Amino acid sequence: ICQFKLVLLGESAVGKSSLVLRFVKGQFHEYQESTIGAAFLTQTVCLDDTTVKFEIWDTAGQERYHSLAPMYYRGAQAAIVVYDITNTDTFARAKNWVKELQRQASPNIVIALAGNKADLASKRAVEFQEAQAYADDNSLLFMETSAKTAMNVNEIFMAIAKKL
Numbered sequence: 721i722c723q724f725k726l727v728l729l730g731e732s733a734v735g736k737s738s739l740v741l742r743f744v745k746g747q748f749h750e751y752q753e754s755t756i757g758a759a760f761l762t763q764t765v766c767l768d769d770t771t772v773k774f775e776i777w778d779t780a781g782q783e784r785y786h787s788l789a790p791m792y793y794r795g796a797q798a799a800i801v802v803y804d805i806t807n808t809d810t811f812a813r814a815k816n817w818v819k820e821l822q823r824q825a826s827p828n829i830v831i832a833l834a835g836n837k838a839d840l841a842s843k844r845a846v847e848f849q850e851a852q853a854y855a856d857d858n859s860l861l862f863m864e865t866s867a868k869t870a871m872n873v874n875e876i877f878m879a880i881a882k883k884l
């Protein structure tokens with residue numbers, strides 16, 4: 721049995737709450753309310769002979785809550801920095817979340833990068849290749865996801881668990 725602390729960070733509206741909701745409850749709400757501060761959820765999965773329990777901190781992406789982020793990532797063993805593939809700005813913002821983690825978070829924290837809303841292919845702004853190269857250059861576990869279709873949602877959390 722294993723337990724890990726996980727934190728989600730990213731610009732507001734990229735889909736952090738939706739990703740957690742899909743993984744923890746298998747639900748997706750087209751009408752999701754912006755998070756105020758942070759929400760907490762847990763999920764237990766079966767991973768190669770080991771039962772892993774995830775303690776997830778879903779932070780509010782709005783800038784006015786930025787100063788509170790350390791409270792959630794300081795003791796985190798893993799982080800998922802989320803961006804919206806349809807918005808280049810959210811990708812740039814995700815890079816700064818990564819820089820912050822790499823500089824102020826645990827030196828041994830596993831950092832994942834999630835290009836969310838990948839189901840909106842006809843509105844893509846960030847090419848998969850660019851995000852992959854960025855992730856490879858910064859040693860980030862990258863995956864394009866979709867809380868809406870569930871694409872790679874379970875996969876990203878599981879890949880993180882395997883590396884912990």
Ligand SMILES: Nc1nc2c(ncn2[C@@H]2O[C@H](COP(=O)(O)OP(=O)(O)NP(=O)(O)O)[C@@H](O)[C@H]2O)c(=O)[nH]1
Nearest residue numbers: 732733734735736737738750752755781866867868
């Ligand atoms: N098409 C599509 N919409 C998505 C996806 N993930 C989230 N959304 C939608 O995007 C909107 C914002 O999602 P939400 O989870 O609230 O974003 P957030 O990053 O948690 N926001 P905040 O940081 O402000 O709390 C919601 O309408 C949600 O339904 C996805 O994979 N695909």
Ligand SMILES: [Mg+2]
Nearest residue numbers: 736737754755
């Ligand atoms: Mg939210």
